[PDB]
Each structure stands twice: as structure tokens, then as C-alpha cells.
Design an enzyme around this catalytic site. Structure first.
Site, short mmCIF file in Angstrom:
data_model
loop_
_atom_site.label_atom_id
_atom_site.label_comp_id
_atom_site.label_asym_id
_atom_site.label_seq_id
_atom_site.Cartn_x
_atom_site.Cartn_y
_atom_site.Cartn_z
N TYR A 71 36.43 54.84 16.46
CA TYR A 71 35.38 53.98 17.06
C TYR A 71 34.98 52.68 16.49
O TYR A 71 34.82 51.69 17.06
CB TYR A 71 34.08 54.67 17.28
CG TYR A 71 33.39 54.64 18.82
CD1 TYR A 71 34.31 54.90 19.89
CD2 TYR A 71 32.18 53.96 18.92
CE1 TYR A 71 33.52 54.72 21.16
CE2 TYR A 71 31.45 53.71 20.11
CZ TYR A 71 32.21 53.93 21.07
OH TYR A 71 31.76 53.86 22.39
N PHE A 123 41.05 29.11 38.04
CA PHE A 123 41.68 30.45 38.19
C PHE A 123 40.91 31.44 39.00
O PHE A 123 39.57 31.03 38.55
CB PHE A 123 42.39 31.23 37.05
CG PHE A 123 43.13 32.49 37.22
CD1 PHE A 123 44.56 32.40 37.89
CD2 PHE A 123 42.50 33.47 36.77
CE1 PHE A 123 44.78 33.73 38.29
CE2 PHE A 123 43.06 34.84 37.19
CZ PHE A 123 44.33 34.98 37.87
N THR A 124 41.25 32.36 39.80
CA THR A 124 40.28 33.02 40.51
C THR A 124 39.05 33.77 39.74
O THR A 124 37.85 33.42 40.04
CB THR A 124 40.70 33.89 41.50
OG1 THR A 124 39.84 34.65 42.23
CG2 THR A 124 41.91 34.93 40.79
N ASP A 214 41.00 28.57 28.26
CA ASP A 214 41.47 29.52 28.98
C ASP A 214 42.97 29.55 28.45
O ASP A 214 43.80 28.81 29.11
CB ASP A 214 41.55 29.30 30.54
CG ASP A 214 42.13 30.23 31.53
OD1 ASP A 214 42.74 31.12 30.75
OD2 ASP A 214 41.96 30.45 32.48
N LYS A 257 49.27 38.36 29.15
CA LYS A 257 50.45 37.25 29.34
C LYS A 257 51.13 37.08 28.11
O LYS A 257 52.08 37.61 27.96
CB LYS A 257 49.60 36.07 29.95
CG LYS A 257 49.28 36.02 31.48
CD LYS A 257 48.37 36.96 32.11
CE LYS A 257 48.10 36.91 33.46
NZ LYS A 257 47.23 35.80 33.76
N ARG A 381 50.68 33.52 48.29
CA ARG A 381 49.63 32.45 47.85
C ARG A 381 49.47 31.64 48.67
O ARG A 381 49.56 30.56 48.35
CB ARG A 381 49.89 32.07 46.19
CG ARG A 381 50.14 33.40 45.20
CD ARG A 381 48.58 33.80 44.68
NE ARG A 381 48.07 34.89 45.54
CZ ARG A 381 46.91 35.24 45.11
NH1 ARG A 381 46.12 35.20 44.14
NH2 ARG A 381 46.41 36.35 46.16
N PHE A 448 44.46 40.21 51.27
CA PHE A 448 45.70 39.92 50.87
C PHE A 448 46.42 41.32 50.26
O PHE A 448 47.45 41.55 50.43
CB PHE A 448 46.00 38.90 49.71
CG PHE A 448 45.24 39.24 48.36
CD1 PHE A 448 46.06 40.13 47.46
CD2 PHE A 448 43.86 38.68 48.33
CE1 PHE A 448 44.95 40.29 46.30
CE2 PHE A 448 43.12 38.79 47.13
CZ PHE A 448 43.75 39.68 46.25
C1 LIG Z 1 45.80 36.17 33.75
C2 LIG Z 1 44.70 34.95 34.14
C3 LIG Z 1 43.50 35.23 33.64
C4 LIG Z 1 42.72 36.46 33.75
O1 LIG Z 1 43.31 37.26 32.78
P1 LIG Z 1 43.48 38.86 32.98
O2 LIG Z 1 44.00 39.43 31.61
O3 LIG Z 1 44.40 39.19 34.23
O4 LIG Z 1 42.19 39.31 33.29
C5 LIG Z 1 42.68 33.89 33.55
N1 LIG Z 1 43.10 32.88 33.62
C6 LIG Z 1 44.34 32.52 33.85
C7 LIG Z 1 44.83 31.20 34.16
C8 LIG Z 1 45.23 33.60 34.05
O5 LIG Z 1 46.56 33.32 34.53
C1 LIG Z 2 30.43 58.14 26.78
C2 LIG Z 2 29.10 58.15 27.63
C3 LIG Z 2 29.25 57.17 28.76
C4 LIG Z 2 29.98 55.99 28.92
O1 LIG Z 2 31.42 56.16 28.83
P1 LIG Z 2 32.22 55.12 28.03
O2 LIG Z 2 33.84 55.68 28.38
O3 LIG Z 2 31.94 55.26 26.68
O4 LIG Z 2 32.21 53.63 28.47
C5 LIG Z 2 28.33 57.32 29.80
N1 LIG Z 2 27.55 58.45 29.84
C6 LIG Z 2 27.50 59.41 28.79
C7 LIG Z 2 26.75 60.53 28.94
C8 LIG Z 2 28.41 59.34 27.95
O5 LIG Z 2 28.59 60.09 26.87
#
Ligand SMILES: *Cc1c(COP(=O)(O)O)cnc(C)c1O
Ligand SMILES: *Cc1c(COP(=O)(O)O)cnc(C)c1O
Ligand SMILES: *Cc1c(COP(=O)(O)O)cnc(C)c1O
Ligand SMILES: *Cc1c(COP(=O)(O)O)cnc(C)c1O
Lengths: 456, 456, 456, 456
Positions: A71, A123-124, A214, A257, A381, A448
Site C-alpha cells: 500500500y 478535450f472532453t 495536457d 497514450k 466523431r 454515441f
Molecule cells: C486521452 C486524453 C485525455 C484523458 O486521458 P485518459 O487516460 O483517457 O483519462 C485527456 N486529454 C487528451 C488530449 C486525451 O487524448
Molecule cells: C476498502 C474500503 C473501502 C474503499 O474501497 P477501496 O477499493 O479501497 O477504494 C470502502 N469501505 C470499506 C469498509 C473499506 O474497507
């Protein structure tokens, strides 16, 4: 060389069921002519996205076997931290499960309600998190980026006069940050020059405005600098990447990416204040700062992959393979966004299908036709993805009616690119025979992803 | 089509260091101009052999994770046994670590001193085990198979007149077995037709003579039948393979070839007494009959791989990729063994280097030149590999003085084939610059493995 | 301490179907009361053998992902060669698929027919290859080693007086080599002292006699030296191993034992001429000297595992876990071979079942009972495995009528040892209920592997 | 039996550097006496958390090799969806990268500002997301659950009178949902009875109040029901789990706990409108509904692991191994939270260190001492983790000043539990020697993660 061979061997393959045209037509009809509804097992060449679809190396798979799943204090975290500090230069890292997790953190930490975020297009997910946290997005990309036909280098560059105008009209204190994206996805994956990054940094520095990149396709961007920006011909990709980030205060990164992984991302920054705040915030959305929603093995794979991405021959081949696809299409007169970006070719489905009106969904129809003719999946798109206006009930009419051919890294060959290009060219040569589409199922949101159609 | 795209995706890549010509020249000098002495890490495209160099699938790698390593009763053994019985049709299987282990067993079981083994040419290990156990080998391939320029289909076929003559002159009871190889390696990987296997079985069945296949490239062979033998156009590879083996009493198999694995082989037979004798013999050479010198995970991977080999598009692409390399060389006038076999292209180093005599080792030198100019490793198959005579001390002068470009399955692309072909074609344009070689270190035996040379 | 905790964590598990006693009885009946016929999937704790059943580490599995499958010059071969040279000290290595492959090579290279091989007891495959090549085996272990009740340390030691008598009576030139096994399997896994290896070397050195070790359990042996031989308490396992092999001219190794792998072995030697002859021979039985019938990944895993075996806490725990099983059985009065060896505990089934005669197969029946009561598989090593006589058709009557509990490395816990011991102790407390067996199906060959029985 | 053996074998190990006490003292000092700052590589037995530290099976690792990394339509998504629907019974699933990602979705979807969430105690992330979205949390656990000494079954049960009072006093329309956790972490991992889940569901149904489970340790909970609840002795774990979830409208799940994985979670619900809204929301925080921030291989591993968790012997052993640690400590008089829960033993550091005041951080110091004496890492769950007051700048004085010994699933043995217990018992025998701590670095945020201390 125009089209170099792959600078790697195939270590393992994903088998494909080479189904017939009749079978593909049946699968496409079962998916309501929506490529987003196709099953992966029914697809030969899946160009839906370059996100998280990359082929890892043998070295990354070795790292996958030595995940230290602790952890806190995982060896894999230390490896990722060391690698990112070395290659990007930022003082601090917070891992996240992917890029949009890092965007959630950055936008919560860096935006006060009523501020503006100035960016080279958007980007979205990135824009969602900016707006959700109270910012108004202002596009400061150069005008040329919006002209899809213009073959110009570094089309992702920011227009410094647009930034100056925003500063003068709104006040620098009201700009939360400049969000400089490399490459620029909405323009087709267009790169930003080092000169532009430096100039944006100089103007921002004068006014105390933070810059966050970004950075999802920063290595593709670095390749374009090496290839095309005078003076960088003999500078290594590694040194280009390091200089790029020297003009930023931090970044959001998607390892999915340019880090050559299937999952992973991170947030970087230089100051203790934001680092401390980000570590407190990451706990409730992603996980502890020592893993950020990633297995140890994935921190390892991402550290290894980012370093692999620095190999010149790898990124040269990556970009030139995309370029090859664009070149074959251009030679046949197929309308595409120009010039070809780092990761995708964007077809102009409006021009591809001049016999269809926009409310007959040219991009959705073309994507369906591409799959039926080849087993290639591409992404709509266009008008369907743009959604229906909640105020008037009419479809939003986007300027770009695009089919996206998005190329995963290290997955496909030039022969696969030929399958794609040959099938698209055959469709273009008989474009008048492509049937349009009409909704038979339309959800109120995310249409979409699950809408279904029949032909007209 | 002539050259289909790969009917699979890349799941993982093997890293390559893209070293320069100067570095390759140094490495080649350090290897004494013997490509067998090069380090794998210094090679871009390694065409030394198609044995055990194949890329496995994701499904095979999943099987590698569920190795049941029990000494007896392993689930993986049962999977391999079931698969081989289904696809090859034989009653019994004894796993071996690779093909030559199965040959050791077969030749100890089926040969008594003074008997003859008749075969369509020979392979080094197979003939060694036959002769070690008292057999005299008799070549019964058609005379045309020895003509490297003859573009003839099914060049591996047995001459039924030669078999009839051997039976008449020696007596059927003195023929230990007919060893029918598919494909025929010494002729360049040439296939045997179903009609020929059928006719050989018909003649052997009249006299009660056993037939055992050397089956290492039986799937390549099945493809040639499907492509070229009348009546098989629409028959599945699986059904062709099953009919092929219906004309045999058993086989030796190297999984390292057509089973798409890096290690593994097996012995198959129908006869119950031979099976029980084989199981008693395998214990001391390979291991218990329940694993045969293989880890459980490797029995699993071999079972999965053999089934994958039945996919038409896979084997069509495999053979057509080799054919592509031969076609590019032929179009440029490079002299090659004809027609191209299933697994390799052979350059004729005599005609490639007409300024060198065979005693100047033109195949060895051509192989060295290919590596220095491209990073491609190829195998000398000529005077050096033939060794020198014991009674006269002179080198053997084999008719075939060749360089073997041996293609692993699922590892390389057409762009890699272009690297190979383009580099060989460029060398051919100035072939007079290839220097002759002389020994500086020559071991007494196995000289091709470790001999060292310098230029004359 | 007496019973240290495992000096490792569990990284991954093999799940088990915890079938009921009634189900185990049905499975045992389907196996005809022969534990060799049980399916692995039906076994909870499989103590059939410590060969090839070991659990690898995460680091070994990482090595499995970077298999360099080249026919020659594999990086994995270089790693294995470097590791074995460093740890064992021999000049040269030839890999083999497992230990009996290396024994085949050694016996063919180092024996002339009619000569003697002198060794400390024997093992089935090792003695076969000696006798197959014309040697006469001479047992030169101390007479005390044959007393299964005698709690003698270093029970594997050679009697130097028996070696002196052989040298004087037969002449040193008629001794092919001395075969010194570490540890000694037939006495239950018993160690040889460093003083004994030193004395054998000094005597052989005077007369020019070669010494080759059967090194399959050399690390277990090194642990016993560290634990029990005066002066070695503070010498590392690595330094003990290195000194051991300094008293030999070479060795045969099964990596399937102390190298912590599931497949692999090798032959080591110092002599250049023997190295050349070994390389010529390995080609026809195993493969080229650069892989020896092993995948590259397996050379890597074996190199990594041999180094892991040098960790003191690992080998201490390995041996003390076996000792724990022996201690718990002894504390309950169960008759066992003494002292406990490095890798197995042997039950004396003759004394366990005094109501049965040997022709009623008490070891076979005891093994069946153990499985039915616990899900533990053990191996019959008594009258059934001894076979039926060649000339008389009568059963052999071995002095040792035993059930072998053979412990794989890093697979089981002390709680598993308690399952084994508790079930055996419970059977011992009503031993009179163990029923005699009689054949219902007896093959002529390898009867231990597939014979089936029913109760008398 | 009290302490059954592991119902699995070890497939692979994680090696450990068995460092000395003096080395551990130096590492503890380098870590500022904060176990959260120790490096994983310096820890023998890491009991910091049971989250994401589990050992996967060979079958899960096989699934890891067939990750279908497609953005939509992955086979692994379909497997996860099918498995969760079968085992938990809910109509719909949205994967998330771990549990807190699902909590973010649920709380945004199901809470209006000012509403109440009623729960059986709370967890930090779960309560954060409820409060962030405008809810007030109300504890409705039975008062006895706060008695850390009380040996009572099903201490996690909701007090139905407290639930009835909340409904009467606040109005059903003002209760967003009942958040029923299984097991209850804050009470030490205490289970909830089926009778209680059924009664809560009946009362909620009368008023239309939704119930969502915090289900992270639902399988441990099911084991306690089988072992201890009247009528459940002969009901399968699978059927208990299915019935538990039949009393809920959905759940948030952490695969990192009872699904036997290192990463992964999900949100389940029955309501179609909530499913549609959850899919909209997941896109921006986690990823598309078809992967939810997980690699395909991880959806596969989580599907396989959840099914493995249903094996009775696995979960019985899991819970009884924790119980064994508690029993050994209790028998020696070490003060612990009672009774032992499913996943951890909590030491009472107040009673362990009666010579220290709470402002001298006895839990933090006890955790440091445990590591120094054994190489076992444990977590401070006391005054340091409780933080310093938001309004007065004073430390909180939590009633529970504990050290958590948190047991990963399938990683450790009973011998490891003995290392833990023996070392703690030895410390307890001279507990007065444990030194108090004082801050040398106290971050204002997330202080337990990086604070550094020195001895008083
Ligand atoms: C891929 C993308 C993101 C988001 O990244 P994720 O890993 O998909 O969450 C943000 N900005 C741009 C330009 C992207 O192409
Ligand atoms: C682990 C835990 C969470 C959160 O889960 P994660 O996968 O660590 O984000 C929520 N509730 C309880 C009781 C937990 O022990
Ligand atoms: C490869 C080969 C063999 C030997 O098989 P191995 O697995 O390499 O031992 C036998 N016959 C032919 C025709 C071969 O090509
Ligand atoms: C295991 C064994 C062998 C044979 O090794 P394999 O790898 O099983 O072929 C030889 N000698 C001894 C003492 C053995 O225990």
C-alpha cells in the site's frame, strides 16, 4: 526513410477470427449500425481509440511479474517516481489510475469559481473537469488549427495575441492556468513547437499565470519537433521532452497514450503547496499517493513504457505508420484532416458522403460501412457524438463530421494499414452507394455509446 | 490475394537495439565472420532458423500460467493427448522435449541392425538416429527434387518406382519403415501431395511396410495441398491434416516448428505394443510418459498452438510471407532455390558470388555480409556445414552452396521482409565486393557452430 | 530455531478442489488403488516427487517473460553460463532438458565398455546410463549407509577404503570415474561431508581418476555441511557450494531439484576435450549447445533459481520443513527411515503393516490409504516398483518396502505437513485395518505406473 | 477444525531479504519511526492493509494473459458482468478502478443536499463522498458495537430501533439511503447477520428507502453467517452471498478486498434510471462504462477472483487464520479488540503501553517497536491518524488507540502468524521499554502518511 520497418519483433500475438463479409454485416446489424456496440471479438483491426490499447514489451511484461503490491513504499512506485522526475523534470508526482483522474485533481486544486482556463483547443474530460470546478474555457489556439485542409506544421501552437487579449480583457489574476496540450487532439493530433511553448512560458511568466500541460501525446509531439523544428534534428527525443516540460509548472498525463500501457496516469507539479494538497485529495478519489488507484505492477509497466517511448526509432515508426495511412488515403483523393497528426487519421465524412445530409449521419454511416467492408472499427466523431440540444431538441451541428481512425501503438503493421486504406478507398470510389442512417433507438444522454440505427 | 495482411494483432513486442553498421561490423569481426557466433541481442531480424523461434499467442501464454507440474496425471498432458488424437488421428502419444527426442525413441523401437529406412531425402538428427540403431538410409525422393531451379509443385513427392525397386531388391521384411517427411527440408521446404501419401500407403500396405512421418512442418504441407492440389481448394486445413496422417502408422513431431511453440515435441503411434515399449524407453531419456521432458505449461502451450495452426488464414499468411520474400528477390534477379518452400528462402551463394570458389566459403561470407549490411542473421548451408572428409582430409563440395533465410512463425512483418530483401538486393548489385573467407579456427567436429574466419 | 517460518511470501496460489473423503475413495478406486494413476486435479498435497514440482519466484517469472528464443547466442544462455561458472566454478557448461539428459552425455563421453564407475549408492536413470554404455557399477558408500535405522550424520560419505581397494585391485586406469552424488537419494536424501569430498579428491588426484558429481541436490547438501560439519558454521552456502565443486572435474545437474525450476538441467566440465565432445553429442539428443533442449525462458529461470537457492534462510527452511514432518512422525512412533533426508521422508511400510506379507503390497496399500484419508499422494517404493523378475517370473523382494513422502520446494506449509503427519498417525493407530492388495491388472512393463489392484 | 491448513498450494513466491534487528532499527529510524514511511523491500510480513495485497491464483494469472484491451466490447467486461450478476444478483454493473470510485458515483447519484445517510458505523472514503454530496451521516449500529471488549456475535448489526427513530424523526423522504456495510471495519471487521439485513430491508421497503451495501468484505461476512447464524450451517457461501445482496438495491464493491485482486471495484444497482445516470458520470471520473478505469485483464482477474472467493474452505481458512493470530495473543494476555473480525486483529495500544499518555503516541510507537523486533509492518489507527482538530488546533483523543494487524488474503502462513504473535508477546512482557514519540515533522495535511517522530 519514408516508412521504416518496425523497430521491434513480435513477441506474442492476439488471434483474430477472420469472419466473412456476410458475418460482419450480421454483426453490424446486431449492433444497430453503431460501431461502439460491436464486440471486440468480432473486430479484426480496432481503431476506435489509441487509449490503453497499446502493445507492451517483453520488458514491461517482466515488470508485470514483479508487482510489489504494498500500500505504501512499493518498489514500483519508487521506479515510476524516479523515471518521471528524470524524464519530465517535475519535482513531484501523484499517480492516478488514468489521465482524467489527474485532471480531476488538477482542476479541483488550481481553479477558483469564476476563473478562466485558456487552452489550445479542448478535450472532453479535461474541459469537463475545468468547468465542473468553476472555470470558463477560452480557446487560444491559432486560427489555422480550425482549417482542416491546411497543410501547415505545428498547427497546435497557441496564438500569443489571443492570450494577450484574454489577459488584457479579463485580468491575469482571473486566469486559473493555461492548459497547453501536446499534441492537440481536436485538430487531428497536431503538434506544438518548442518555440511556442517557450513563448507561452515567457508571456505567462510576466503575468504570473500557471501553465499545466495536457501531456498525453507529448512523445509524439517531441518527434514532430525533432523532425520539423529547425535546430532539433540531432537532439534526442529524451532531451526534447525534458525541454518541453521545462516550460510548464506541471502536467496531467495519461500513460494509456504515450507511456505504452493499458492503464495508468499521473499528475506532476513543482511546488510543495500543490503537492501537499494533491496528496490529500487523491486519497478520496484514487487511493493513497503511493499508488493512486494503480496496482504496483502497473506503476512498473508505466515506468518501463515511458522510457521505451524515448527510443527514436520507436516513435519515428509510430508517427510514420500513421502518416502512411494518411498518405495512402490522400493519394486516392479521400478527404482527410491535414496534415496527419501523431496518433490518428480523421476522415471528413461530410465530404466523403456528399449525397447524405447531416441529419442522415454521414460519419456514423461511414464508420458502419468501413466495418462491414473490412472488419475495421473506427469512431464516429460527428453529429451523433455532438448530441441533441437540450433547449431546442435539434441536433447540434458540429463543424467537423469526422470518422476517427485511431492507431494503437505497436499493435498493427503496414499491411493492416493497407487493409484499412484499401477498404476506405473502395468505399470512396463508390461513395454514392453508402446508405445513410436514421435513429431507431436514441438515449437521452451518451447517445454515441448505445444509440441504434437503421439504413435509409 | 498474393500477400494477405497478418490475421492477428501484435499483443506484445520484443525490444530491439537498433545498432549501426559500424557496430555490426565490429560484432561480426568478434564473431569471426561466423553468423552462428553472433549474440542474439546484436541481431535485428534473426533468420537463423524457424525452430523454436515462433511467437506464441495470448491464449498460449494464458496456458503457460496454468502449468500443472505434477509428475503424473497433469491436466496439461490430458489436454495435449486429446488435441493430438483429435487432429492427427493416432491412437497413442508420448511427449518428448522436442522432435529429435521422438526420433531417438522411434529409431530404437522400429529398427533392427541391417534394415533399411527409405525416405524422401533426410534431416541430420533423423538420419543419425536411424543409422545409430543400425539402419541404412535410402533416398526415394523423385530425382527432380534435387534440381534447385525446377519450379515444380510437390517437389517432396516420393518416386514410387524407387520404392518398388527397393522392395524388390531388398525384400519388404528388411525395410524397417518408410520415413515420409512433410515438408522436405533438404529441397528447400517442399511439400508432398496427398495423392503421393495415398500412393505410398497403398504400396506399403500391400507388403505390410510401416510408414512413419517426420511431421515437423505438416501444417505448411497441408497449406500447399489446399492451395495447389486438385480437389482440396475448399477442404479445411484440419481435414487435410487428418487425411495426411491417415496414411501413416505414426509420426515424430517437433512442436518447435508447426505447433507454434518454443520447445516441445512428441511421438505418435497406433500400435499398442510399440506404445508400451515407447513408454518404457522414454523414462531414461526424456522423463515419464506423462510429461516426456516437458514442463506441464509447455504441454499446454503446444496443445493450444497446434490447434491455432489449423486456422487457414494463419497458415496461408505464414507461407505467403515466405513467398513474398522469395518473390522480391526473384524480381530483382537474385538467385534462389525454386520454388519457395513453406518456411525459408535459400540464396544460391555460388551464383551470388561467381568471383569466389567454393573453397573460399561464399555462403559463409555472404551470410556475414548480409548481417553487416542489414542486421539480418542467416545460416550457412554449404561447404562449411558439410564438413571435411575423414579419409581424404578435403572439404566436401556440396552441390548446394546456400544461405538460408529461415522465417519464424508470427514474429516478423512484410516490412521486415523488405529490410531483408532490400539489403540482399543492394549487396547483389555489387556482389564482387563480397570477400572470400579462410579458416583461422576450425574445430574437429560441428565446425559450423564455432569456426572462425578471416578475409582472404 | 527448530522450525523457522517461510523466508518468503506467497505471490500466487494453485487452487485445490477440497473433495470429500467419499469422493477421494471413489477416485482411489478408479485408480485401482495405485496412487500413480490419480489425476493431479484430485490431489490436495502431491508428495509423489520433488522433481520439477517447485514453486518459482516472482523474479523467476519475470525472467520467463524475457525468454530470448534464439537458436544460438541467447542472452538467457549467457546468463545461465555466467551464473553456473560463478557459483559452481567449472570452466564449461552444456545445457540439457533435465538431469538424465546430462547423464546420457556424460556416460557416453566418459565410459568405455567393461570399465567401472564407483559411486555412493545409485539412482535409476544415472545407473541406467552407466550400464547402457558398458560400465559396471560399484557401490563404495559406507556399509553403515545401508542401515535404514541408523541415525548417522553424513550417511552419503564414500568409504575411502572401498575406493582404495578398487584402485588397487582393478587399477586406476580401469576406473572411468567416481560418481559422487550430493545428496544420496537411495538412503533417503543423505549428505556428504566436505572432508569426504576433499579426501576423495586427494586420492583420485594421486591416481589421475576423474570425479563427476551427481549434483541434483547439492544445495540441500551444502546446508547439512553448514549445519553439522565442524568449521562451516559461519561459511556461506555459496562458499560451501563453491568449495564442494572444487573437488570435482565436472557434474551433472537436474535443475528440477535444487535450481527451483520445473524443467532444466546441465552438464559441467573443466576439460576442453570433453567439452568439445559433449557439444557434438548434445546436438543429436537434446539440441544445440546454446540451448540443450530448453527454451530460452527456462535457461533464464534456472539461472535465477540456482542463485535463489543460495539464500541461507531459504535452504534452512526447506530442509527443516522436511525435518518437521519426520519429527512429528517419529514423536508418534511411526516407523521411518533415519535420519530424515533433505527432500523426503520414507515410511517403513513393512513395520507399518506387520499383519501383511510383502506379497500383499503393504507399501502400495499404505499409499492408497494415505490418499483416501487426507488427499495426500505419496509414492510406492517397494515390491511393486521393484518389478517381476526377468528369469523366474517371481516378484523381487526388496529389503526396503517403503512409502516416499517427497517434498517439493516452496509449495507447501507446516500446516500441510500437519495434514500429512496427522493422517499417517491416525492410520498408524489402527494399522491393522489397512488391507492387503492383489493385482487385478498387471502390465509387463513399468508396472508401478499403471497396475491396478483390489483388496484381498 | 480450529485451524485448518491452507486449502491451496503455493504456485509462486515473493522472496524476502531476511535482514537483522540492527538493520531494521536503522530502517525504522530512517523512516522517522513511522511505519507508513518504510520501504516494502525492507518488510518481511506486511500487515499494513488487506486492501489490494492479496495473492492471486494461477487461474487469475491466466486471465491476466488474455486481457482484451478494447475500449468497448471487451470480453473481459462481459465476463465480469456475467459473474457479478450471477453471484450478487443485481441487474446492472458499472466497473470502477476500486471501491472509492464506485462510492463517488453512488453518492453523486443518490444524495440530494441535506438528506441523511444512515449506516452501521462508517469508513473514511465512503463517508467523505456522502458528506461531499450534501448528506449528514447518522450511525445506527447497535450501541454494543462500540464496546471493544464485548465478545458478541454479529456486532455489526444495525439497531432497528435507531433506524425506526431516524425515519420517524427525519422522514423517509429525507433519507437518501441506508448504507449497510459488511463487515463493519470500524468495530474491527465485525459481521452483520442475515436476520438483520432482512429486517432492515423490510423496514426500508415499508417507507421506500433505498439500501446500498458497502460490500468490500461481504464474503468474510458470509462465512460468519455460515459458521454462527441459526439455520445457515448447511447453506453454501455462494447462496449466503446471493441472499445478502437480495436485501439491497445496489452496492459499492472493492475487488481489492474480497475479490482476491490487487486493483478493481464496481458499482451495482437494479434501477434502470440510476444505471443510465451512473454510466454518464463514470465517463468523466473513471472511464467508459465498458472498462471503468480498469485494464481488461483486471476485469478478468476480478471476475475469476470473486468466484474463487465462494469456495467454503478458502474463506473458512481466511477467517480462521486471522482468528488464530487473535487466539495466540489473547492466550498470552495481550489486549485486543474483541471478538476477532474477518480481516485483522487490533491491538489496544493504550493498555499495551500504560506508561505512555496518548499524546506520546503509544499506537505509533508500538507499531515501530513491532517492526524493529520482527520485520512485521502494522498500521497506526489512533491519535496520529485521527488528526488535529479543525477548530482548536488540538489533537483528537480517540477512544480507540490501536495498532492494526491487517491480513492480506492467501499471502501468509500460520508460521508467519507465529512470527507476528511471538514478537508482540515478547514485547508485551517488557512493555515498559516501549518509548514515547514526539513529532519532529508534522504535515498540516494527511499527517499519518508522512509525519516523522523521535523518541521522548
Ligand atoms: C486521452 C486524453 C485525455 C484523458 O486521458 P485518459 O487516460 O483517457 O483519462 C485527456 N486529454 C487528451 C488530449 C486525451 O487524448
Ligand atoms: C476498502 C474500503 C473501502 C474503499 O474501497 P477501496 O477499493 O479501497 O477504494 C470502502 N469501505 C470499506 C469498509 C473499506 O474497507
Ligand atoms: C527440426 C527438424 C527435426 C528435429 O526436430 P527438433 O525439434 O529440432 O529436435 C526433424 N526433422 C526435420 C525435417 C526438421 O526440420
Ligand atoms: C532426479 C534425479 C536424477 C535425474 O534428474 P532428472 O532431471 O529427473 O532427469 C539423477 N540423480 C538423482 C540423485 C536424482 O534425484
Amino acid at each position: 526513410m519514408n516508412y521504416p520497418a518496425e523497430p521491434f519483433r513480435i513477441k506474442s500475438v492476439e488471434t483474430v477470427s477472420m469472419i466473412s463479409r456476410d458475418e460482419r454485416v450480421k454483426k453490424m446489424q446486431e449492433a444497430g449500425y453503431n460501431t461502439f456496440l460491436l464486440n471486440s471479438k468480432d473486430i479484426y483491426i480496432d481503431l476506435l481509440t489509441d487509449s490503453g490499447t497499446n502493445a507492451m514489451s517483453d520488458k514491461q511484461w517482466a515488470g508485470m511479474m514483479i508487482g510489489d503490491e504494498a500500500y505504501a513504499g512499493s518498489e514500483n512506485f519508487y521506479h515510476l517516481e524516479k523515471t518521471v522526475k528524470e524524464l519530465f523534470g517535475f519535482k513531484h508526482i501523484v499517480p492516478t489510475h488514468q489521465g482524467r483522474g489527474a485532471e480531476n485533481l488538477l482542476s479541483q486544486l488550481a481553479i477558483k469559481p469564476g476563473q478562466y482556463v485558456a487552452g489550445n483547443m479542448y478535450f472532453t474530460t479535461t474541459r469537463f473537469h475545468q468547468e465542473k470546478n468553476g472555470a470558463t474555457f477560452v480557446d487560444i489556439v491559432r486560427d489555422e488549427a480550425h482549417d482542416a485542409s491546411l497543410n501547415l506544421p505545428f498547427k497546435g501552437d497557441i496564438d500569443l495575441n489571443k492570450l494577450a487579449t484574454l489577459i488584457k480583457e479579463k485580468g491575469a489574476e482571473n486566469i486559473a492556468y493555461i492548459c497547453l496540450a501536446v499534441t492537440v487532439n481536436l485538430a487531428g493530433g497536431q503538434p506544438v513547437s518548442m518555440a511556442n511553448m517557450r513563448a507561452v512560458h515567457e508571456m505567462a511568466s510576466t503575468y504570473g499565470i500557471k501553465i499545466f500541460y495536457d501531456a498525453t501525446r507529448c512523445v509524439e509531439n517531441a518527434y514532430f519537433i525533432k523532425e520539423q523544428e529547425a535546430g532539433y534534428e540531432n537532439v534526442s527525443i529524451k532531451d526534447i521532452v525534458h525541454e518541453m516540460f521545462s516550460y510548464a509548472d506541471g502536467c496531467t498525463m495519461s500513460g494509456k497514450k504515450d507511456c505504452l500501457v493499458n492503464i495508468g496516469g499521473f499528475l506532476c507539479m513543482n511546488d510543495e503547496e500543490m503537492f501537499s494538497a494533491a496528496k490529500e485529495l487523491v486519497v478520496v478519489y484514487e487511493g493513497m499517493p503511493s499508488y493512486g488507484g494503480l496496482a504496483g505492477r502497473d506503476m512498473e509497466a508505466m515506468a518501463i513504457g515511458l522510457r521505451e517511448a524515448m527510443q527514436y526509432e520507436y516513435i519515428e515508426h509510430r508517427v510514420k505508420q500513421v502518416r502512411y495511412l494518411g498518405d495512402k488515403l490522400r493519394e486516392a483523393g479521400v478527404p482527410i484532416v491535414e496534415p496527419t497528426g501523431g496518433h490518428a487519421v480523421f476522415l471528413d465524412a461530410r465530404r466523403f458522403c456528399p449525397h447524405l445530409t447531416q441529419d442522415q449521419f454521414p460519419a456514423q454511416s461511414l464508420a458502419a460501412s468501413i466495418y462491414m467492408e473490412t472488419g475495421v472499427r473506427s469512431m464516429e466523431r460527428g453529429i451523433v457524438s455532438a448530441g441533441r440540444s437540450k433547449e431546442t431538441g435539434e441536433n447540434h451541428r458540429p463543424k467537423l463530421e469526422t470518422v476517427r481512425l485511431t492507431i494503437p501503438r505497436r499493435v498493427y503493421t503496414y499491411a493492416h494499414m493497407d487493409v484499412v486504406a484499401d477498404g476506405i478507398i473502395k468505399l470512396y470510389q463508390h461513395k454514392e452507394d453508402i446508405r445513410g442512417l436514421t435513429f431507431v433507438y436514441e438515449p437521452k444522454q451518451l447517445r454515441f455509446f448505445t444509440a441504434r440505427f437503421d439504413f435509409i
